[model samples]
Target chain A: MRIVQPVIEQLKAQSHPVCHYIYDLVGLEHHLQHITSSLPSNCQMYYAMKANSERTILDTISQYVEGFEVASQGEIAKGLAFKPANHIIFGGPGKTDEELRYAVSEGVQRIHVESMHELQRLNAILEDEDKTQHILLRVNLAPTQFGISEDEVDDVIEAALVMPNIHLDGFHFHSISNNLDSNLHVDVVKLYFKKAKSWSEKHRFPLKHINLGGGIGVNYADLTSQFEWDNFVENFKTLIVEQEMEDVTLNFECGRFIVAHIGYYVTEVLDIKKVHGAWYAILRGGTQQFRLPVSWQHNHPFEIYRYKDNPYSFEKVSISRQDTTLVGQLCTPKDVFAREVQIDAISTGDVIVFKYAGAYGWSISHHDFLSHPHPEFIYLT
Target chain B: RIVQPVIEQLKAQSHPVCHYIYDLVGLEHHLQHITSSLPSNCQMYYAMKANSERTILDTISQYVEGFEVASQGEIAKGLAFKPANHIIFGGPGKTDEELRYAVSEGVQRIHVESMHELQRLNAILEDEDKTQHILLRVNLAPTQFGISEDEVDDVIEAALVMPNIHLDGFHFHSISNNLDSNLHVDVVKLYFKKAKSWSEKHRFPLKHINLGGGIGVNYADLTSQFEWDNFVENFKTLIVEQEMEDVTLNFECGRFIVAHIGYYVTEVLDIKKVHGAWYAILRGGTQQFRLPVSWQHNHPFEIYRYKDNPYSFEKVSISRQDTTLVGQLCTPKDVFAREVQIDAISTGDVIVFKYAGAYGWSISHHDFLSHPHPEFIYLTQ
Candidate 1:
C-alpha cells in the first residue's frame, strides 16, 4: 500500500504551486511492523522524535510505534500532543534549566541524564519536591568488545558511576547496524552483553534495559539489493540471545533506513537568473527547509514533469549552459536551494519537484529571513 | 512636494535606482505631521545627522522655523534650507573647522556640550566682534537621553566663563521606544523641571528650549485609530507644559513617525527545506534594503498571486517551526527573518513586505554580496 510513482504523478498533475510534503505513511508503518515483528517479547521500539517531529507524520507512526525518543520540551510537547506520553524517553546533552524543570515537574515517562551536571540539577529539584526521579545513564562501550576504539567504551562507564540520586535503569549502544561489516556488529553486541555480565557480577545492580540503538543505515542510495538482512538478525541473536544477559529488554530507535526514498520535495521553478556564466533555476524550494544539500552536500535527483508528454532527451551541458542563476527573493544571499543543477532546458513556472522529501520535509526549518512560509499540510490517506 | 518629480527622474534612470532622499523623508514628514497636529507654539527642527538629505531638510525647514545641525555636511544642508539665524548646532565631538564654519556662517544657535567647545567658538567669533549664539547643553539629571547632569554643569560653567558666547537656551531629551504612545508625556515632564530651573538661574528670556523629538509613529496601533486624536492631544499637553517666554522650541524625530507607510515589494524565488524546516527565499536581501534586519519585525509577507484568489485575502503563514526564511544566495546568515511569518507562496509569486519606507531602504547596507539596491517610489496622493 506504499503510494509510489503513480501517487506522485497524480499530485504533480494537479500542479498547484506550494511545497508538496510527500508523507510515506504507508511505507513507514510497514517498515515498523517488518523490523519489529521478530524482536524479543520484552524488546521495545522508540521513534527518535528529533529525526522528524511533524505532527501529521508522527501521528501516523503513532498508530504502529510503541513509544518516542524526545530531546527537548518543544519536541516532548509536540510528541505528547500527537499521542499520550506513556513511554517517551528524553535524551540529549545540555538540557536547559527550563526543559529540565518542566520535565521533572510534569513527570515525563523517562528522562535520560547524559551528563553529571544534568543529574545534579535533577537531584536538586527532586530533593525540594521529596520525590524520586527515574533516569538512565547512556553507557559507552569499553575497549576489547566492539569495533569502537577502547577509549570510547571506558568514557561511558566512567560517566555512569558519578551521577547522583537518579536510578540507573540500563545502558544504550548504537553499535554498527548499517555502518560496520557483519563481523563488527556481531562483535559489538557480544561486547555489550559481556559488559552487562561483568557489571552484574561486580555490583549485582541488575540491568533492566539494553538499548541496541539502531542506526540501520539504509542503502537507499540503492534500495534494490535484497540486503544482507538474515546475517544482521543472526548476529543480534548470537550476541544477546545465547548469552546469560537475557533479562535486559532490548530497544531500537530506527530512522532514515525506514524513510529516505519514500519522500521527495516537489518544487516549481520561480525564475532563472544567469549569473557569472552559470544557469541557476531558482526553484520554489530551498535548503532552509531541506538540509540534504545544505548539510550533506549530496545531490538529490531532480526531474521535470512537463505538461502533456513530449518526447524529450537529456543533454549534458557546461555550468554556464545558459545565462542563469537560480535565485529566491528572501532578501538574503544564503537563500539558494541548489547551485548550478543540470537541466536540459527549463522554463520559468516549470513544475520540477525534488525526490525524497517525505521524512524531514514538513518538520524542519524556521522563520528565517522574510521568505515565504511553509505550505498547508494534509494526510495522503 | 518635489518627491514625485524625483521619483520620475529615478524612473527615467531605470528600474534599479538609488534615492539618497529616503533618509530625510522620514524625519521631515514626522516633524510636519506632529507640528500641524499639535499646539501652534511648539516647533520641530530636523535632526539632520540621523538623516541629512537636502530635499527632506528643505521640506522640514519650511514647516519649522529652525533645525538641529550636526557635522559640516548637515550644516551646509541646513544653511541652504533654513536662514543662517535659525540654525542650531549640537553634537558630542565637534571639529575646529566646523566651529569656525558655524561662527563664519552666523548660525543662530550652537548647543555646546563641553567647556572646550565654548572657548573655541568664542575665540572664533571674538576676532570678528560678533557674538556666537550658544546654548549651554546641561546634561540634565534623570533624563533618559545622552549626557548626564554633571556634564551639563561643566558646560554651563564654561559658557559663563566665555562672555563672548551668548547662552540662549536649555535642551533635554528622554529614553524612548520607537513609536511608543507614552514618550511625548515622559519627555514633557522632564523638560519642564529643567526649563524652570535654567530660567530661574539665568534670569534671562531663555530664547529657545529644544525638546529632542522621540515622537513615535505607531504603525498598526495608530492605523487602527486613523484619527490620531489621542497622539495630537498628548502632544498638545506636553508642549503646553514646557512654555517658555518668546523662545523657539525644537524636536528631533528619527523613526517615531515615518516607518508605517513604506513597503518592499519583492518576488518569491524558491521554496525548499533545510535542517527539517521550510522556507521561501526571496530575491530581495539586506544589500538591497536593510530595514527588515533592523526593528527585527518579521514583516507579514503577503503573496499577490497574479490576481489568483484561492488564499488571497486569507493570510497563509510560514511554518511556526520549519520556517528558515532567507534571501536567494549561497552564504549563511543572509536572512531578513531568522524565522518570519509569510504567505504560502509559490515560485514567481510577488511578495510585498509592508511598512518599509524611511529607514527601511537606507542605513546598514552595502553591495557586499553584490545584491542591487532597491529603487524608491513615492506613493503620494
Candidate 2:
C-alpha cells in the first residue's frame, strides 16, 4: 500500500531540495489490472480524470480503462487526446452553450444532462448542427446541488424522448463522495439499478446505458483497509444479472480509488519546533501543493525518508517522542496538513511522504497561495 | 470603492465567458484611504498572500511602507518593484535557502515563528556574515504556527545572545477573516499591550510592532463590512493614550485592502429549476475564483443582463426568483451562492462577483479538470 522502493538517493541527486509529487505509473498499472480484470463484459470502466488528471496518470490508466469521464470542455479535449470521442462520457453540471456545442461537435459518447434546460439547450445545439446526441438524464436522489430531482427526472426524460436530436440512453445516478462502507455502497448501486429499471419499465423505454457515477473512497487513516472491491464487483454483477439488465451497459466512473495508492506527496521538512507547548513541523509545501488532508479533515497517511544523515552543521534539534502538528509554509492559520498527531522522531531535512495523494490532491488545491514555487512532479515508470 | 474601472475594462473585451477585472485606480484610492485613516506612527504594509498579481503589487507598493511576504518566491516578487529592504518576511517553514535569501537581500524584518527557525536563521546569517532584523511571532491560540507564548521567552533569550540577528519587536496575528472593526481594534490593542510588557520585562528594544492582517471582507452581507474607519479611529486613540507613538505599528492587511477593488466576472452558461429551486451555472467554478466556495458564502453578485437570450431556438428565459449559483464542475461542491433572491437571471447574462479582488484569483486551484482559464484585466484608468 505504501512505497515499494526507496527513492531518496534519486531525489537527493538533484541540485536543490524541494517538494515533489511522485507518481508510480507502474504501481497504477498493477492496481488497474486487478480492478479492470474483475469487471464483466457488460460493465465498462471509465476513469474520472478529475481526481488526478496528470498526463502520466491518464496515459497509464488509459491502458486498463475502456473510456474516460470528463466534466468540462477542457477535460473533453484531454479525453480526446487519449481515448476516442465514443469512449468519452461528458458528465457535469452547468454545460455552457460553447461546451455543449464542443461536446456535440467532438462526438462524446454520452452527455449526462443535469437539468431540463440543459436537455433543451443541448437538443437545440444539435438541431442547429443537424446532428443527434446520446445523453443520460442525471437523477438526484438527495438535495444535492448538481443534478435534477427524482420527481423532475420523468419530465426531463419525456422532453429528451420527444426531442429529435436527443438519443436518450438511460439515467445517471451520482450522489455520494468518499464512500467507505462497501455494503452500503453496494446497496446504493442496487437501488440505482432498481430505480432505473423501474423507470424504464414505466416509460417502456429501451435504455442502452445506465451510468452509475463514481464516489469510491480511499481510506487514508489505514491504507490497508480498502473498500471491498471484490464484494462490489460480485454484487454489481449479481444485480445486473438479477435485474435482467446485463444487456445494458453499466458504466462505472471512478477517480480517487483508482489512483490514490499510486501517488505520494513528498515535501521536505523545513523547520521543526514546539509551538504553544505543542510540537510542530513545517513543510516546504502547504495546502498549496496537496490539500486532500486539509480539505477532507483527515490526517493524511505519510512516511518519513531521511535525505541526509546531517542536514545542517548547526544545532538543528529534532522532535523526540512527542505529538507533532504538520503544517505548510502558507501564512494563514488554515494552512495545515496533520494536527496533534503522535510522532516518533522527526527532524528538519527529512521528507514526509504523504500517501493517498493521487486524487483530489494537487488537482483540487489552491496552488499559487503565497506565490510559492510549485512542487516538482516525478513520474516513476 | 467604485467599480467603474471594472465596468470599463469588461467592455474592452474578449468574447470571454469568464474573466477577472482589477481596478488599479480603485485599489490605490482604497489603499490611500486606509493609509490616511491610520495614525502617523502606524505604517501600512500590503500582505501579498491575498492577491499577489504583479499589477496589484505595483499599485499597492506606492502606498505601503513595505510588502509583507510569506515565501522566498514572494520575497523575490516584492523585490522586483520595491527595494529589498522594504520586503518583510513572515510565516512558518522558512527553509535554509529562503532565510539565506532574505538575509542576503537585506529584507526589512523576518518574523521568526519557531526556535529551530531562529536557530536556522542565526546559522544562515552567521555563514553569510550578515545581520538581519527579526520579530518573534507569538502564538496565542491553537493554530499550527507561531512561537508559543511560553516558547517566546526562550526564543527571545536566544535572539538577544545570537550574533548576526537583531530582535526588533514581536508579531501577534491571531484571528483570520474577522468582520468586526471593534474586535480588530481590541486584537491590535492586545498585541500592543503584550509586546510592550514583554519588551519592558526583557529590557529589549522595540522598534516596530508587526500587526499581522486579520481584517476580513463581509462576504455574507456586503453592507456590514469591516468598519475600517472605526477601526482606524480606535487604533489612533489607543496609540495616543498609550503614548506609544515612537514604536512603529505595521498593518499588513491583504483581504480588506484589495477585496472590494476586484470583480470576478463570468457568463451564465445554463439556467434551470430542480425540485422548486432555481440554478444558474457559470462558466467558472472553484478553479478560477475559489474564494466563495472556499469560505462557503453567498458571495454577492450582480447580473450584467446580456439582452440576447442564449437559446433563441427554445425559450428557456427564467423569470424573477431565488437562484443558487453554481460552476460547471462535476462535483456537487462546485457551488458559489445557495438560494439567493435574484430579480432576473438567464443564460448568456454576465455575472459579476463583488469583493473578489483579493483571494479570488490568488487562492483558486487553477487547472482543476483542465478548465479554460479566465482572463485577468487590470483597469488603470
Candidate 3:
C-alpha cells in the first residue's frame, strides 16, 4: 500500500496509540494485478500457508487461487476454514502422529512425507485402522544450484517406494533461495521431472506434479526497482520451453513474491541515543514486525515522510550507551528489532517506515516469551 | 498502580515510554495470596516447572507446603526451598541418578510409573533397609482434556511385598478430563472409589490416596470463578471417608496456578509495513518469555503512550497478507505476535502483556542471541 499523505496525518491525528499501521488493501491488490496476467491458466496456485494465513488474506486469495500448502495441523485448520479441504495440500518436515491423524480426519488432499520415520508413523496409524492414505514424497532434489546433496534425494525416494499403506502419488522437490532465477528454476524443474519419470516407471505410480516451492525473491535491498514480476513470469515460461518438459501439472508454493511489496511497517522513533559517533532511531517496532530488514540483515532504506507529499529525507541514527540496544518490550533480549541499526537523522517521535514486510514475517516466531493480540487485517479488492 | 502512572508522567517529560522496575516485594505478596487460596487438609505443592528463579521460589516457600520437583535440577532447586520431607518427586522418565538423588534427599514421597520402577526403587531402598513412601500411578480413564494418556497401570497389583516398598496408598492421574465430562472431577473421585474398594479387599490398610493434580486451570475464562476450593474439599472428604487409607493428601500441580499470572511486557521499538501491513519490533524476545509465537489466543497487551499522543488511533501490521513480527534481537525467530493488532504505535510506546509469572527467569537463557533480559514488576495492593 502506497503511503498516501492524508492517511499518515489521519493516523497521526487520532489520539489512539499504536505501534504500526498497515494499509494491506493497498498492497494485496497490487500483487494480484501484477501476477494475474503472468501465470499459466493450468498451473495450480498453492499459496504456502507458512507465509501468512490471515483470514482476510485467505478469503481474498480464495477467489483467485486453487488451494493452500500447509505444514502443520494448525495451518491445515486455518486453511480448511476458508478453502475446500480437497484444495489444501499439506507439506512439511517432521509430520507428527497427531498432525497426520488430524490431516486425514479433515480429508486433506495430500500429506507430503519428509522422512522415513514420519512414513513409519504414517503407516502404523493407517495399518492400525486398516486404511490407505494418499502421499507425496518430498524428494530432496540435489540440484547443485539448489544447495542439497545427492544422497538425501536417494534416501527419501527409496523410503517412499517401500513404505506400506501409502499411495505414493508423485515426487515433490523444492529448490533453495538464489535458485529462483530462470536458469536455476528451469534446470531444477527439468531435473525433478527426470526423477519423477524414472520413479514413476520403477514404482508403477502416477507422476502428477513437480511441486516447486516458490520463493520469488524480490530484491527489497533496492526499493526503487519495482519487483520485476513480468520478467519473473516470462523467465519461468521461457525456462519451461527451454526444458522441453510436458504434461505434468506445476504447483507453486509462493511466500514473498505474491505479497512482499504490498505492505510497509510505519514506526515512530522512541529513543535517539548515540554510541561513539552515530545517531539511532530507537523505533517503536523492531525485528518482530519487519524481519526482512533483520533476515536480509541490512539497514533498511527509509525516507522520512511527515505527511506523504514531502520529498522524503533519509534519517541517520545509531545505537546508544547504557548498552542501550534498540529493543522491544515483549520481554526478552532478542527483541532488538534492528541491532545497532544506523539510520538517517531521527529523534524520539519521528516516524520511520520499513518497506517489504508482507511475507515470511508472520509465521516465524520462537519461544513462549508472551503473546500479542492479532494484528488488524484488511483486504485489497 | 499510582506509582507506575506517576513514573509514566515523569518519563513523559523526557522519554516517550516508561520501562518497569522488577520489584521483589510485589511478587512475594502475590505468591502468598495464591497459596492462601488452597484447602486446609490438602497440602499445596509449588511446582518448580513454572518458575525456577531462586528469589521467586524462595519467596514462594514461605507460603507453600512443599515443592513438586520434575527434574533433579528442580529437586535441587526444591531442596533450596523445602525440607527433604516436604518435597515429592514426579514426572515421566525420571533419571536413575535423579531417583537416586531423591532417595538420598529423603523426599517425603517417590511415585513410580512402571512395575519395573517399583522393583528398582524397592531394591535401592532395601540396600539401606530404609522404607520409602510410595504411590502407584494408575493411568485412569482419560477424558480428553489436554493431558497425555500413557504409562499407567490399569490393574491393582497387591502392594509389592517388600520391606522397603511401603505402598501407603494408590495414585490415579486423570489430567485429560474435559469440563463437560462431569468425570473431569468425577474420574479422580472414581479412582478414590476404586482405591477404597481394592484396599479393603486386599486388607491393605491404605493411609493416603494421591489423587493426582488435574484440577482444571480455568484459563479459557480468566475472569470467571472455577471454585477449585470446593473441588479440593470434596477430594479431601473422600480421603477422610476411607478410614483404612492414610489420612494424608497429595496432589501434583505443575500448571494450574502459574501459567496465567506471569506476564512479559515490551516496548514498541519500531514500526514498518513490508508487503501490505505493519510490523512492530519490541524490546522482548523468546529467551525470557515463553509465549508460543503462534497461539490460538494471545495474551493481552496495552500500548502505553508516555508522551502526548501524536498519531491517529490506527492499527498497523508489517504486511497485510503476512507480517512477520520479530523481537528486537539478532535471532530471526524471537517473535511475539504474528498477525496481532496494535494501536498504530511507534517507538518508545510501552507494550505491557499480562500473565507471565512462570518459567526460568532471573536466570536461564540462550546467551547465543545476546538479548537484554526483561525487568519484572510484582503487583501488590
Candidate 4:
C-alpha cells in the first residue's frame, strides 16, 4: 500500500525535530476486517495487545476482533479499557499473583494456565474471592517443533481436575510464532484438536474451546509470499467438519500478522556522507526507534522521497544508484537501519520511509539510548 | 567493594509496586577510585551517553576532569551540570543546528567524524565569527584494535587549514569493549605515537589526545578478571618510555566506570515449565533493562526470597538444570537470562541483576507495551 499523501504531508509539517511513527488506521481496519471476514466463523480472532497497543489501535481493533489477548496486568487493564472483561483472555507463562488477582477481579473471560502451579495459584485466588474462574490449561506439547511435553500437559490437566474454584474450559496450544506454512499450521491445529478431544474424553470433562495460538506470519522478505490465510481458513473449516468438532471454538491470538503492514516509520535524512569508501546516509532516528530490521537481520523495504527543494546550502551531492548505508543518530555501530542498500540518489533532507513496521517496529526499540527526543506517533485515518 | 549498606537498606525498604535500586555512594567511590588510579597528567572525561541521569552527572562532575558527549541533547545535558569549556562533543552525522549549538556554547572539543562535519563546523564557526576547538575522530587502520583507516589522514590534513577552527588534537577513539589490557595498551601507544609523528610532520601543536571509550567487562564470567590497575600501569609506563610530554591524554571512559555500580531489581512474576525447560518471568523486560539481551549473555543475578502465602492447594515441585528468564513484554526477544543453570526459583522472589549501572536503565525501550513505569530509587550515603 502506498503511504497516503496526508501522512507524508503531516510528517513534512512537523514543528519539532523528531522521527514519526505514522500509522494508517483505515488500512489497519481494512486488514483486520479482511482477515476476519476471510477466516472461518469457527476460527475467532483475538487481538494480541502485545503488538501495538496504542489506544486508537486497540479501540479500532476491539470493534472488529472477537476478544483481546493479554500477557500482563498492564495489558489486561488496557484490554479492559477498550473491551468488556468478558472479551479479554489473559495468557503468558509468568503471570504474577497481583496480575492474576487483577484479572480475576476484573472478570476476565479466561486465563490460560501455563503450569500446574499457576492453576493452583489461580484456584486459590478465586476460592478466596468466592469466584469460579474460567481457565484453559496451556499445554506445552512435545511435538517435533515448538511446545511443552505431553507429560507436563497431563500433569496440569490432572491438577486442574481437582481444583475447586477453577473451571477447566479446554486446552491452549500456542507454540510456533511467525509460521508462514499455512498447511503445516493447519496440520498442527488438527493435531492439537485431536489431543484435546482425547484428553477431555479420558478425563470426562467437557471441552469448551481449543485455542490454536496464532502462528500466521507476515513475509517481510517478500510481501507477496505472506501466509496463505484463505487456504488455511478453508482447510481449517474442512478439518473441523470432518472430525465433527463443530462445537469447539478455535481461537487465534494474532499480533504482527494483524498490524505489521499498516505502519510506516518515517525519518528524514540528516546527513549523507561517504565514510571509508562506503556512503552512509544518517537519519534523525536509529535502531532505538525501529529495531526490527536489525533484530530480524533483514533489509527492511523502504522508499525514498527526494526533496523538491534542497535543505542544505553548502554542498550539492549527486549520485546514480550508489550503495548506501542508512544509520540512526546513535553512536554504536549496531544502530544501523540498513547496510549496503542500493538506492537511486540519496541526499541530505531526503525522506526514507521504512515499510512493514506496524507491530514490533516502534515498541521493541530502546528509545532513550542517547536521551534523544522520542519519535512522534501519528495515526492516519 | 561490597554492595553499599545504603543500597541494601533502601532495596529492603521500598514500599512501591515496582522499582530499580541505584547506589550513588558506591558509584561515587567507584568513579573516584577509577579517576584517582590514572596518572596526574592523564585527563579523564566521563562519557555521559552511558547514563545521563542528572543525579549521575552531578555525582561524576565532582570527580572527573570533564565530560564527553555524543548528541545535541547530551551537550545540553552536560552543559547544565558542567561548564561548556569542560564538555567535549563527538558523534557521527552532526546536524547543522548541533554544530552551531556546540560552537555557540564554546564546547572544549568537537571530534569531527566525517569531512562533511569538518566543513560544516568550519562554516558555522566562521559565520558566528568565533574560533571553535576541534578534534579529528580518525577511523583508524583496519586492525582488531581501531576504526577503518581509509580517508582519516586526508581529513586531518584538511582540518589543519580551516581558518575559523582551532585544531586541538586528534581523537583516536575507535575501539569498543577491549578486555585485554596488554593488547589495549599496545594499540593505544601505537595510536599516540602515530598521532605525535603526524603532528610533527604537519607542524601542528597537539593540545589534547582522546583515546575513545572501549574498556569491556565480562558479563558471563562475572569475575573481577579485568584489572584496571594493570591497564593503567602499562599505559603510564608507555607514556614515560615514549616521553609524550606536551599533550594531555583524555580517556573517555563511560561503560567501564559506571556499568558495575547499578543494579536492576525486578520481581519474579511467574514460574512455568515450557517443554522440558523452566521459565522465570519477570515484571520488567528488555523494555526496562536491555543489557543482558543486548549483550546476549547472562547477567549476574541474585534471588531475594519472598514468602507469599502458598496459594496452590496442591504441593507440586519440579527440578531444573536450565532456566530461561523472560520479561513481561509479549515478543519472544524479550528474554533476559537464557538457559542459565541456577537453583529452582519461585514466584514473588526478587532478582537483583548486578553490573547494570551504565547501560541498563537508560538505554531501554520503556514504553514498549504501555506497561507501568518502574520506580527509580536512589540511595545516597
Best by lDDT: 2
Candidate 4: DockQ? 0.45
Across A204-304, the per-residue lDDT of candidate 4 in tens digits comes to: 89988888887678888787798888898888888989888888877889998999988888887776666556777888878888999888887888888
Best by DockQ: 2
Query: Which one is best on TM-score?
Result: 2
Candidate with more favorable, higher lDDT: 1 or 2: 2
Q: Rank candidates, TM-score, best first.
A: 2, 4, 3, 1
Better of 1 and 4 by TM-score: 4
| Chain A, model 2: TM | 0.96
Residue B110, candidate 1: how far off, in angstroms? Answer: 44
**Candidate 2 at residue B144, lDDT?**
65
Question: RMSD (Cα, Å) of candidate 2?
Answer: 2.7
**For residue B296, what is the lDDT in candidate 2?**
79
B1-381 per-residue lDDT for model 1 (tens digits): 334345344435533223323435554565567678755556656665333444545556667767676556567777787777878777543545667888888887877654444655676777667888776655454211223565564456566666687777786654434444565566666776786676677565567677775555443343542234575677566655555434566666544444554456654444544334456555555544555554554554444553232221222234344354555332344466655444455544555555554455434333322234555554333
Q: Distance from true position, residue A320, model 1, in Å?
A: 13
Question: Which interface RMSD values do the candidates have, in the order shown?
Answer: 23.7, 2.0, 25.2, 4.0
Mind giving the per-residue lDDT tens digits that candidate 3 earns over A77-144? 88887887778888754344566777777778887765454566677777767767777777654311
How would you encode candidate 1's per-residue C-alpha lDDT over A269-373 as one tens digit per residue? 544333223445555545545645443444555566543432113122123234334433232334444555566666644556565665433343431222234
Model 2 stretches astray by more than 4 angstroms: A1-5, A12-18, A306-308, B1-16, B178-186, B314-322
On the 0 to 100 scale, the lDDT of residue A70 in model 4 is: 85
**Cα TM-score per model:** 0.46, 0.93, 0.49, 0.92
For candidate 1, the iRMS in Å is 23.7
Q: Is the docking of candidate 2 incorrect, acceptable, medium or high quality?
A: medium
